[PDB]
Amino acid sequence: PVVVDIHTHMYPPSYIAMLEKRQTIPLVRTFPRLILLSSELAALDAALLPGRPLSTHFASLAQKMHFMDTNGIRVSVISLANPWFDFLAPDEAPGIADAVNAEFSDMCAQHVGRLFFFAALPLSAPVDAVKASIERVKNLKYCRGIILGTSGLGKGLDDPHLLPVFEAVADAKLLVFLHPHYGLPNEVYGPRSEEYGHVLPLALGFPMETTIAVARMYMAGVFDHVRNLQMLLAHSGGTLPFLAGRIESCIVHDGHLVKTGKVPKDRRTIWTVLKEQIYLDAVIYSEVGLQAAIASSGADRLMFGTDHPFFPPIEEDVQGPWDSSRLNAQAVIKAVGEGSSDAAAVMGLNAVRVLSLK
Amino acid sequence: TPVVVDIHTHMYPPSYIAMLEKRQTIPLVRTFPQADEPRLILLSSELAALDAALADPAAKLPGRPLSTHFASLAQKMHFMDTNGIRVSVISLANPWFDFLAPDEAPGIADAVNAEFSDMCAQHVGRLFFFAALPLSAPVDAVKASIERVKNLKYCRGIILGTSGLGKGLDDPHLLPVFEAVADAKLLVFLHPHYGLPNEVYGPRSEEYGHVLPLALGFPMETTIAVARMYMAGVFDHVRNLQMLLAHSGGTLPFLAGRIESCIVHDGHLVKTGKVPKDRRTIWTVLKEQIYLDAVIYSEVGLQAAIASSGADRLMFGTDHPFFPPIEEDVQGPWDSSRLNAQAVIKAVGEGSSDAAAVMGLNAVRVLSLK
Ligand SMILES: [Zn+2]
Ligand SMILES: [Zn+2]
């Protein structure tokens, strides 16, 4: 069966030009260096070494195909990487989103049958412009969904003004790939965080941000309001499979919510949402986490990803197989067994079915 | 029939409650004219509701109800009898002595710890305790308190929060505290309280009750604190340190793989020699120096915890009395306790050797509960 990577990124050339133009994070400059995160500010100021290196791996389509060929991946569903268009002024974002989504469509056309994309949306623009962009991207060749950050329009996913956006994407039958970026306020990592490289913001901040975003969305009733909405969660839902039971217990034991009628007997539990409206990527690095994800959403709702090109080997050949991909592939084998139907499903067949790649 | 032990179960002695009643800023206990039962206001996430309640009689009561269960030893024993628990290892709840002034802290801690010992003496064989420390005081005052704690009947460990001496658990000033407790063979029960900066929950945070700070803030706090300890090499510098993590390690069993991948793929750490071949992985630490409570509410989470630390390193708890049933006239076991017992049964099977271990025999062995 076919191996599909649904969590894989590129920065197209026109997007790169935007980051070198910028004065504040997010930005790109030579010391090029990719400085995307708030946690990287202290290292940047000391260097004005900071952030992570900008490589050919972000920008080159040839490099993407080579990665796929050397890591046993047949199909990639590529997306613009964080932070997308969030920093752009409301009047300019639609035009830039258009140009970038056009570049992705054109890239996919270069390797017919091996490349599809999640489109990025001009979420700093008015809702009318966002809806216009949605209608445009659903008619671009090779587009198979939307990538969305946790901040939504700027006030998170429980923002009432975002509901028409959710409705529009759902009605268009576009899968929403939710992806972190803002992490947690750097103060939580304490006065020694610089000593630990990027480990705390990447290993903890990102998945925690995703969990909080989805929990807010769930608590605000978004999934009930937009019943046809389907969402794919980055990094196996962040921590959601592990905390789902705790969330449920805290809800049913919340005095205020129960007494104010927010916990009716017929409420759809987070477990139900996890099985009905949520897909999970398998970017989790261990069969321990992966088994929890499978138990939460079902093996028919888990999808292999690599997070290419963010985790290259540090000492091994960057042109050879990547450990950061192998770890996830091995997690699948260890959890459900090599050659099994579950393995085939997670490794690509689920994505083929859900994204109509067949 | 195997002994059932609850290792995550709390009390506030009347003297401690008296301190909170006198406080003008969180943490505090306050009575409002609307209700009769006092309000327990412990968390920074509760400040907005507290300020609104002080300025408006129509606003919702802030914090949670200060039920009699917090101070009543009789109600603790009733709870144990009605929930099939033979032994409780009780502990002062958050925020312990963290808020006390340095000068006063050691004396108060010593007295409160003495009170816990005396409570345990009331029901011999059924009650043990984790002691709390005066961590706002100088490190040598803390070490003096650990020495006293060593001498107390029924004490089997230390409970503490994530702030340490004030700079978190990776603070090198805290290393001798870990050394002293480890040398004393006192298990360290790490428990959340401080959560996350409230802005992370967004502008509609006040609409979701306590769900976000309790369901997310608490376990995330625990995960961050332990990850900091791990990255700072605390588990390597104090090889005999044994830690019990609240709420099945927060999120650690689910993120352990991600943490490991981020380490081995960190350019800075690899290039500066911080990822040597002989590094003890988080998986190794989880099997060798970490115990996990089973306060996770689902077999899904529980199975991940078991795979991470092993069935011999998981311990049943209830978090009594923080999650009472909301509906009146309710009889029998608390749902919040029953959920955890059912999670164990679903994960490892009723009457199994693993079930006996998680439900009490692990605690009996590790904490020498006879
Ligand atoms: Zn990514
Ligand atoms: Zn507790």
XYZ file of C-alpha atoms and ligand atoms in Angstrom:
730
model
C 0.000 0.000 0.000
C 0.863 3.697 -0.415
C 2.761 5.724 2.206
C 1.325 9.235 2.648
C 2.936 12.035 4.689
C 0.250 14.547 5.828
C 2.491 16.685 8.082
C 5.184 18.170 5.901
C 6.113 21.773 5.161
C 7.611 24.227 2.708
C 8.336 27.948 2.523
C 7.954 29.070 -1.124
C 10.390 31.728 -2.471
C 7.905 34.625 -2.307
C 7.204 33.806 1.339
C 10.949 33.804 2.128
C 11.212 37.317 0.636
C 8.606 38.429 3.175
C 10.620 37.153 6.168
C 13.849 38.921 5.121
C 11.731 42.092 4.734
C 10.589 41.861 8.373
C 12.110 43.623 11.399
C 10.602 41.522 14.199
C 10.012 37.797 14.763
C 9.075 36.078 12.506
C 12.121 36.888 10.388
C 14.984 35.472 8.327
C 18.547 36.852 8.215
C 22.164 35.763 7.672
C 24.689 35.483 10.521
C 20.288 32.378 6.645
C 18.688 31.833 10.082
C 15.013 30.967 10.546
C 13.714 32.776 13.645
C 10.007 31.982 14.039
C 9.272 31.576 17.745
C 8.827 33.989 20.682
C 11.207 31.743 22.674
C 13.984 32.691 20.213
C 13.828 36.444 21.011
C 16.492 36.391 23.772
C 18.978 34.569 21.504
C 18.216 37.033 18.677
C 18.832 40.156 20.810
C 22.148 38.713 22.041
C 23.125 38.064 18.397
C 22.241 41.610 17.249
C 23.425 31.543 16.198
C 19.747 32.393 16.907
C 16.792 30.208 15.875
C 17.299 27.324 13.454
C 19.134 27.254 10.095
C 17.286 28.090 6.883
C 18.195 25.258 4.545
C 17.419 24.224 0.980
C 15.098 21.740 2.726
C 12.485 24.430 3.348
C 12.463 25.974 -0.115
C 13.486 23.323 -2.658
C 10.891 21.055 -4.286
C 13.699 18.812 -5.584
C 14.825 18.405 -1.968
C 11.261 17.484 -0.936
C 11.069 14.742 -3.571
C 14.505 13.409 -2.578
C 13.409 13.299 1.039
C 10.325 11.302 -0.023
C 12.394 8.937 -2.217
C 14.948 8.256 0.540
C 12.347 7.840 3.310
C 9.870 5.548 1.501
C 7.125 8.167 1.113
C 4.982 7.977 -2.051
C 2.689 10.988 -1.445
C 3.142 14.256 0.485
C 0.348 16.651 1.446
C 2.473 19.759 1.897
C 1.533 22.866 3.866
C 3.003 26.291 4.477
C 4.796 26.166 7.821
C 4.019 28.277 10.863
C 3.367 31.254 11.180
C 1.654 31.478 7.781
C 0.062 34.858 7.052
C -0.846 35.862 10.652
C 1.569 38.833 10.879
C 0.342 40.525 7.672
C -1.804 43.681 7.575
C -5.520 42.963 6.865
C -5.458 44.620 3.420
C -2.418 42.721 2.068
C -3.006 39.208 3.467
C -5.601 38.041 0.866
C -3.341 38.918 -2.093
C -0.351 37.170 -0.538
C -2.398 34.089 0.457
C -3.603 33.887 -3.164
C -0.060 34.027 -4.556
C 1.239 31.469 -2.056
C -1.657 29.028 -2.596
C -1.097 29.372 -6.362
C 2.594 28.466 -5.854
C 1.615 25.338 -3.900
C -0.848 24.271 -6.615
C 1.867 24.765 -9.255
C 4.422 22.803 -7.186
C 1.994 19.879 -6.908
C 1.524 19.896 -10.700
C 5.272 19.185 -11.127
C 4.878 15.717 -9.576
C 1.364 14.614 -10.440
C 0.030 11.964 -8.061
C 2.745 12.460 -5.436
C 1.909 15.964 -4.159
C -1.201 17.597 -2.702
C -1.505 20.580 -0.362
C -3.293 22.173 2.553
C -3.931 25.834 1.703
C -3.168 28.685 4.093
C -5.796 31.372 4.765
C -5.520 35.169 5.241
C -6.720 35.012 8.867
C -5.550 38.555 9.686
C -8.036 39.816 7.062
C -11.818 40.343 7.520
C -14.045 37.228 7.612
C -15.554 38.136 4.213
C -12.051 37.989 2.664
C -11.339 34.688 4.459
C -14.540 33.161 3.045
C -13.581 34.445 -0.426
C -10.154 32.768 -0.096
C -11.827 29.488 0.994
C -14.052 29.461 -2.102
C -10.978 30.118 -4.279
C -8.752 27.405 -2.766
C -11.384 24.648 -3.018
C -11.092 25.125 -6.817
C -7.296 24.956 -6.991
C -5.864 21.738 -8.412
C -4.343 19.444 -5.731
C -5.728 21.365 -2.735
C -7.101 18.887 -0.174
C -7.734 21.100 2.836
C -6.737 24.049 4.972
C -3.959 24.571 7.494
C -5.059 26.702 10.457
C -3.112 28.106 13.413
C -4.382 28.034 16.994
C -4.913 31.815 17.220
C -7.693 31.793 14.558
C -8.572 35.426 13.772
C -6.420 36.563 16.705
C -8.646 35.564 19.642
C -8.409 31.756 19.467
C -10.697 29.030 18.160
C -13.597 29.783 20.522
C -13.976 33.249 18.958
C -17.629 33.608 17.817
C -16.463 35.552 14.726
C -14.581 32.472 13.553
C -17.727 30.288 13.362
C -18.627 31.359 9.781
C -15.063 30.394 8.740
C -15.501 26.921 10.254
C -18.887 26.609 8.538
C -17.430 27.669 5.147
C -14.531 25.176 5.293
C -16.834 22.363 6.476
C -19.411 23.069 3.730
C -16.559 23.027 1.196
C -15.613 19.560 2.575
C -12.055 20.676 3.264
C -10.187 19.013 6.115
C -8.798 21.513 8.645
C -5.240 20.763 9.761
C -4.780 22.492 13.133
C -1.153 23.328 13.886
C 0.539 25.116 16.790
C 2.989 28.058 16.646
C 2.597 30.473 19.518
C 3.429 27.838 22.161
C 3.322 28.967 25.790
C 4.620 32.233 27.334
C 8.386 31.752 27.708
C 8.314 32.548 31.458
C 6.943 29.042 32.170
C 10.282 27.459 31.189
C 12.141 29.378 33.893
C 15.501 31.221 34.074
C 17.587 28.306 32.697
C 15.587 27.622 29.497
C 18.344 28.947 27.167
C 20.528 26.075 28.446
C 18.122 23.462 27.074
C 18.204 24.586 23.416
C 14.776 24.398 21.754
C 13.645 21.320 23.694
C 11.030 22.852 26.020
C 9.202 25.085 23.480
C 9.202 22.331 20.819
C 8.582 19.230 22.982
C 6.119 20.847 25.392
C 4.923 24.276 24.203
C 3.610 23.201 20.786
C 1.571 20.141 21.880
C 0.253 22.004 24.956
C -0.864 24.966 22.791
C -2.777 22.576 20.478
C -4.472 20.907 23.468
C -5.588 24.240 24.956
C -6.844 25.475 21.574
C -8.938 22.341 20.935
C -10.256 22.187 24.511
C -11.455 25.828 24.220
C -13.074 25.001 20.879
C -14.785 21.970 22.444
C -15.909 23.862 25.589
C -17.346 26.674 23.423
C -19.473 24.105 21.566
C -17.872 24.580 18.120
C -18.066 20.877 17.200
C -21.805 20.797 18.010
C -22.417 24.052 16.102
C -20.574 22.844 13.005
C -21.456 19.160 12.916
C -19.861 18.538 9.506
C -16.501 20.029 10.594
C -13.570 17.602 10.360
C -10.231 18.522 11.936
C -6.769 16.936 11.775
C -4.711 17.620 14.895
C -0.945 18.080 14.775
C 1.265 15.855 16.952
C -1.449 13.291 17.741
C -3.654 15.990 19.292
C -0.829 17.415 21.385
C -1.736 15.818 24.722
C -5.492 15.373 24.154
C -5.593 11.530 24.101
C -3.826 11.500 27.477
C -5.958 14.230 29.107
C -9.384 13.400 27.594
C -10.471 11.478 30.721
C -9.315 14.308 32.999
C -11.171 16.885 30.865
C -14.381 14.805 31.103
C -14.107 14.360 34.863
C -13.420 18.071 35.412
C -16.492 19.007 33.317
C -18.949 16.656 35.092
C -17.561 17.703 38.496
C -17.660 21.438 37.808
C -20.201 22.912 40.248
C -20.708 26.143 38.309
C -21.115 24.525 34.901
C -23.463 21.802 36.188
C -25.662 24.257 38.115
C -25.842 26.703 35.174
C -27.036 23.996 32.750
C -23.814 23.610 30.743
C -23.577 19.851 31.490
C -26.841 18.324 30.164
C -27.327 14.526 30.101
C -27.243 14.409 26.282
C -23.959 16.347 25.877
C -21.516 14.958 23.316
C -18.395 13.936 25.257
C -14.855 14.706 24.069
C -14.578 10.944 23.409
C -17.437 11.140 20.922
C -15.865 14.177 19.209
C -12.522 12.322 19.065
C -14.192 9.453 17.175
C -16.500 11.568 14.963
C -14.899 14.912 14.048
C -11.213 14.598 14.905
C -8.343 12.996 13.012
C -4.915 12.685 14.607
C -1.511 12.706 12.970
C 0.999 10.061 14.135
C 3.853 12.521 14.778
C 4.332 11.216 18.308
C 7.683 9.364 18.170
C 6.692 6.460 20.455
C 4.294 3.513 20.354
C 3.280 4.605 23.892
C 1.775 7.887 22.672
C 0.575 6.294 19.436
C -1.432 3.583 21.239
C -3.176 6.253 23.339
C -4.053 8.112 20.113
C -5.375 4.914 18.468
C -7.501 4.148 21.551
C -8.931 7.695 21.420
C -9.726 8.157 17.716
C -9.450 4.659 16.206
C -6.800 3.251 13.863
C -8.917 4.448 10.916
C -8.433 8.062 12.076
C -4.628 8.157 12.553
C -2.353 9.501 9.796
C 1.434 9.240 9.370
C 3.477 12.456 9.155
C 7.117 13.566 9.444
C 7.144 17.308 10.207
C 9.726 17.615 7.397
C 11.965 19.611 7.243
C 12.111 20.727 10.863
C 14.038 17.849 12.427
C 17.086 17.003 10.257
C 19.792 14.657 11.549
C 22.474 16.687 13.348
C 25.469 14.425 12.696
C 24.199 11.919 10.119
C 23.777 12.630 6.388
C 20.853 15.040 5.791
C 20.556 13.470 2.322
C 20.071 9.993 3.809
C 17.106 8.645 5.830
C 15.858 10.879 8.664
C 15.571 9.496 12.184
C 12.703 11.949 12.821
C 10.713 10.114 10.132
C 11.892 6.596 11.072
C 10.888 7.081 14.740
C 7.250 7.581 13.726
C 7.284 4.697 11.215
C 8.738 2.429 13.925
C 6.083 3.599 16.410
C 3.402 2.409 13.956
C 5.081 -0.997 13.476
C 5.545 -1.454 17.244
C 1.931 -0.447 18.022
C -0.070 -2.351 15.375
C 2.462 -4.709 13.762
C 4.274 -4.587 10.424
C 2.183 -5.615 7.396
C -1.132 -5.355 9.263
C -4.188 -3.572 7.873
C -3.906 -1.059 10.743
C -0.313 -0.294 9.709
C -1.398 0.235 6.086
C -4.220 2.542 7.250
C -2.050 4.759 9.488
C 0.873 4.859 7.018
C -1.239 6.161 4.117
C -4.577 4.494 3.383
C -6.512 6.641 5.891
C -5.222 9.805 4.192
C -6.049 8.343 0.742
C -9.633 7.717 1.904
C -10.252 10.938 3.840
C -8.514 13.243 1.351
C -9.763 11.477 -1.832
C -6.255 10.835 -3.188
C -7.341 7.535 -4.803
C -8.204 -9.570 49.954
C -5.339 -7.186 48.946
C -4.860 -3.865 50.759
C -6.190 -0.815 48.890
C -4.074 2.322 49.392
C -4.901 5.891 48.328
C -1.665 7.942 47.906
C -3.303 11.123 46.589
C -5.614 12.414 49.250
C -5.617 15.718 51.090
C -6.436 17.576 54.271
C -6.154 21.135 55.600
C -5.893 21.165 59.429
C -8.067 23.776 61.211
C -4.954 25.869 62.058
C -4.064 26.026 58.358
C -7.614 27.058 57.394
C -7.375 29.769 60.089
C -4.281 31.159 58.323
C -6.151 31.297 54.985
C -9.155 33.040 56.597
C -6.859 35.900 57.682
C -5.243 36.345 54.260
C -6.202 39.273 52.035
C -4.750 37.888 48.792
C -4.875 34.448 47.156
C -4.613 31.881 48.632
C -7.456 32.658 51.021
C -10.739 31.528 52.544
C -13.650 33.971 52.522
C -17.324 33.860 53.496
C -19.855 35.633 51.278
C -23.384 36.694 52.388
C -24.930 34.712 49.487
C -23.696 31.387 50.863
C -22.998 30.046 54.357
C -20.222 27.623 53.459
C -16.875 29.444 53.100
C -15.099 29.721 49.740
C -11.671 28.234 49.131
C -9.822 30.527 46.727
C -6.419 29.033 45.867
C -5.618 29.670 42.214
C -4.496 32.717 40.219
C -7.152 31.783 37.632
C -9.757 32.556 40.337
C -8.709 36.201 40.864
C -11.088 37.748 38.292
C -14.099 35.929 39.800
C -12.955 36.934 43.317
C -12.669 40.636 42.401
C -16.085 40.543 40.689
C -17.700 38.868 43.728
C -16.313 41.519 46.096
C -17.772 44.334 43.959
C -21.123 42.724 43.042
C -23.495 40.694 45.300
C -25.140 39.140 42.208
C -21.887 37.684 40.803
C -21.112 33.954 41.114
C -19.341 32.683 44.235
C -15.572 32.551 43.576
C -13.257 29.557 44.081
C -14.652 26.247 45.334
C -16.714 25.375 48.426
C -14.700 24.871 51.612
C -16.562 21.733 52.651
C -16.051 20.135 56.054
C -14.154 17.305 54.286
C -10.959 19.339 54.167
C -10.479 19.388 57.963
C -12.546 16.405 59.138
C -10.553 13.282 59.995
C -13.855 11.496 60.766
C -15.093 12.265 57.241
C -11.771 11.037 55.837
C -12.284 7.656 57.530
C -15.924 7.570 56.377
C -14.763 8.220 52.818
C -12.220 5.375 53.055
C -14.808 2.950 54.483
C -17.366 3.835 51.778
C -14.849 3.750 48.904
C -13.096 0.475 49.754
C -9.821 2.099 50.881
C -7.846 0.467 53.725
C -4.965 2.967 53.964
C -4.614 6.636 53.032
C -1.314 8.436 52.735
C -2.666 11.914 53.393
C -0.977 15.194 52.487
C -1.468 18.915 52.977
C -3.024 20.279 49.803
C -1.657 23.067 47.626
C -0.251 25.607 48.149
C 1.344 24.125 51.305
C 3.641 26.627 53.007
C 4.786 28.378 49.798
C 3.052 31.675 50.684
C 4.478 32.039 54.216
C 7.065 34.672 55.152
C 10.577 33.159 55.484
C 10.982 33.916 59.224
C 7.657 32.344 60.261
C 7.636 29.398 57.825
C 9.848 26.819 59.630
C 7.913 27.050 62.922
C 4.525 26.774 61.198
C 5.670 23.853 59.015
C 7.039 21.964 62.037
C 3.745 22.417 63.931
C 1.549 21.417 60.963
C 3.706 18.338 60.251
C 3.410 17.399 63.944
C -0.398 17.717 63.589
C -0.427 15.337 60.617
C 1.586 12.782 62.603
C -0.956 13.041 65.447
C -3.879 12.611 63.026
C -2.309 9.398 61.721
C -1.910 8.203 65.324
C -5.730 8.325 65.678
C -6.214 5.420 63.245
C -3.131 3.239 63.545
C -2.394 1.173 60.440
C -4.813 3.114 58.245
C -3.091 6.506 57.995
C 0.341 7.697 56.891
C 1.413 11.101 55.547
C 3.561 13.146 53.177
C 5.069 16.123 55.031
C 5.337 19.600 53.498
C 8.399 21.863 53.773
C 9.020 25.556 54.558
C 10.429 26.250 51.086
C 10.109 30.051 51.389
C 12.793 29.883 54.111
C 16.595 29.561 53.619
C 17.876 26.175 52.416
C 19.407 25.356 55.823
C 16.040 25.944 57.527
C 14.500 23.532 54.973
C 17.185 20.925 55.785
C 16.444 21.358 59.507
C 12.738 20.686 58.777
C 13.613 17.528 56.815
C 15.606 16.342 59.862
C 12.539 16.824 62.096
C 10.280 15.126 59.528
C 12.581 12.068 59.550
C 11.760 11.623 63.263
C 7.945 11.695 62.874
C 5.890 8.499 63.218
C 3.696 7.720 60.166
C 5.593 10.075 57.824
C 6.505 8.345 54.564
C 7.459 11.200 52.265
C 7.425 14.845 51.268
C 4.853 16.730 49.201
C 5.998 19.818 47.294
C 5.055 22.101 44.414
C 6.829 23.181 41.261
C 8.223 26.519 42.481
C 10.952 24.960 44.681
C 12.716 27.743 46.590
C 11.149 30.267 44.198
C 13.004 29.551 40.943
C 11.576 26.151 39.992
C 12.892 22.616 40.327
C 16.020 23.067 38.177
C 17.348 25.713 40.607
C 20.822 24.561 41.754
C 20.047 26.045 45.218
C 17.425 23.322 45.535
C 19.841 20.438 44.900
C 20.710 19.877 48.604
C 16.981 19.644 49.399
C 16.623 16.785 46.873
C 19.811 15.233 48.308
C 18.524 15.390 51.902
C 15.111 13.849 51.104
C 16.690 11.166 48.899
C 19.254 10.293 51.615
C 16.384 10.065 54.119
C 14.602 7.665 51.733
C 11.547 9.932 51.655
C 9.522 9.684 48.445
C 8.943 13.123 46.901
C 5.351 13.687 45.788
C 5.355 16.460 43.158
C 1.980 18.183 42.850
C 0.687 21.074 40.705
C -0.742 24.450 41.842
C 0.691 27.365 39.887
C -0.640 26.233 36.489
C -0.042 28.393 33.425
C -0.307 32.177 32.906
C -4.060 32.729 32.634
C -3.830 34.560 29.274
C -3.345 31.171 27.531
C -7.020 30.323 28.125
C -8.239 33.349 26.135
C -10.890 36.085 26.547
C -13.733 33.596 27.221
C -11.859 31.844 30.064
C -14.457 32.923 32.665
C -17.134 30.877 30.837
C -15.606 27.428 31.299
C -15.660 27.129 35.119
C -12.492 25.502 36.535
C -12.139 23.088 33.620
C -9.142 24.631 31.831
C -6.897 25.401 34.844
C -7.667 22.030 36.492
C -7.863 19.735 33.449
C -5.001 21.367 31.528
C -3.075 23.877 33.657
C -2.300 21.383 36.445
C -0.919 18.431 34.413
C 0.946 20.779 32.024
C 2.590 22.533 34.977
C 3.754 19.147 36.346
C 5.126 18.124 32.946
C 7.089 21.371 32.526
C 8.542 21.190 36.047
C 9.760 17.577 35.671
C 11.104 18.207 32.148
C 13.128 21.134 33.554
C 14.507 18.850 36.322
C 15.385 16.249 33.728
C 17.057 18.699 31.317
C 19.061 20.203 34.222
C 20.394 16.726 35.077
C 18.754 16.637 38.523
C 18.034 12.901 38.231
C 21.711 12.341 37.375
C 23.058 14.604 40.153
C 20.802 12.944 42.722
C 20.838 9.296 41.659
C 18.900 8.071 44.712
C 16.084 10.589 44.191
C 12.651 8.970 43.905
C 9.682 11.098 42.807
C 5.932 10.399 42.704
C 4.166 12.477 40.037
C 0.592 13.726 40.462
C -1.984 12.875 37.768
C 0.086 10.133 36.133
C 2.956 12.526 35.399
C 0.697 15.201 33.958
C 1.311 14.558 30.254
C 4.802 13.029 30.482
C 3.900 9.471 29.369
C 2.322 10.905 26.203
C 5.178 13.345 25.468
C 8.211 11.274 26.516
C 8.851 10.182 22.900
C 8.600 13.771 21.646
C 10.953 15.017 24.385
C 13.533 12.381 23.401
C 13.292 13.211 19.687
C 13.617 16.953 20.370
C 16.756 16.289 22.468
C 18.585 14.086 19.930
C 17.613 16.549 17.163
C 18.674 19.711 19.009
C 21.620 21.206 17.103
C 22.769 23.316 20.045
C 22.681 20.499 22.605
C 24.310 17.940 20.285
C 27.055 20.370 19.165
C 27.858 21.456 22.756
C 28.177 17.842 23.949
C 24.946 17.746 25.979
C 23.668 14.611 24.187
C 26.458 12.053 24.876
C 26.158 8.330 24.035
C 25.881 7.461 27.746
C 22.930 9.797 28.445
C 20.143 8.360 30.584
C 16.955 8.819 28.528
C 13.647 10.052 29.966
C 12.404 6.459 29.494
C 15.151 5.213 31.792
C 14.344 7.871 34.420
C 10.630 6.938 34.167
C 11.474 3.295 34.978
C 14.103 4.013 37.657
C 13.333 7.195 39.596
C 9.727 8.111 38.804
C 6.495 6.720 40.245
C 3.145 7.783 38.811
C -0.201 8.093 40.538
C -3.200 6.585 38.710
C -5.345 9.739 38.969
C -5.984 9.823 35.217
C -9.705 8.976 34.892
C -9.365 6.741 31.798
C -7.834 3.405 30.810
C -6.381 5.247 27.773
C -4.158 7.478 29.919
C -3.555 4.701 32.440
C -2.232 2.310 29.767
C 0.224 4.965 28.532
C 1.393 5.507 32.143
C 1.812 1.720 32.652
C 3.804 1.383 29.412
C 6.019 4.301 30.540
C 6.830 3.410 34.171
C 5.603 -0.199 34.518
C 2.640 -1.634 36.457
C 4.857 -1.920 39.561
C 5.371 1.881 39.584
C 1.726 3.037 39.353
C -0.265 3.923 42.485
C -4.013 4.467 42.993
C -5.228 7.833 44.323
C -8.507 9.794 44.565
C -7.629 13.479 45.026
C -10.154 13.522 47.903
C -11.867 15.825 48.745
C -11.518 18.126 45.729
C -14.027 16.532 43.343
C -17.232 15.824 45.296
C -20.415 14.788 43.491
C -22.399 17.907 42.506
C -25.857 16.297 42.769
C -27.409 16.248 46.264
C -28.669 13.150 48.144
C -26.006 10.940 46.498
C -25.099 7.644 48.176
C -22.068 5.353 47.961
C -18.647 5.899 46.332
C -17.578 9.183 44.745
C -17.616 9.110 40.966
C -14.221 10.893 40.910
C -12.720 7.954 42.846
C -14.724 5.249 41.048
C -13.560 6.502 37.619
C -9.955 5.744 38.606
C -10.742 2.299 40.070
C -12.657 1.434 36.866
C -9.722 2.680 34.758
C -7.445 0.177 36.555
C -9.915 -2.694 36.023
C -10.358 -1.815 32.330
C -6.586 -1.471 31.769
C -5.259 -4.555 33.613
C -8.308 -6.656 34.592
C -10.197 -7.146 37.861
C -8.501 -9.419 40.416
C -5.231 -9.456 38.457
C -1.762 -9.182 40.013
C -1.356 -5.826 38.249
C -4.689 -4.608 39.680
C -3.617 -5.515 43.232
C -0.277 -3.724 42.666
C -1.732 -0.455 41.345
C -4.606 -0.409 43.857
C -2.314 -0.703 46.883
C 0.484 -3.269 46.939
C 2.928 -0.941 45.135
C 2.330 1.740 47.775
C 2.722 -0.880 50.566
C 6.126 -1.922 49.163
C 7.549 1.490 48.227
C 6.286 3.343 51.308
C 6.844 0.526 53.843
C 3.213 0.575 55.025
C 3.668 -2.866 56.673
Zn 4.763 21.087 11.715
Zn -4.317 16.848 44.579
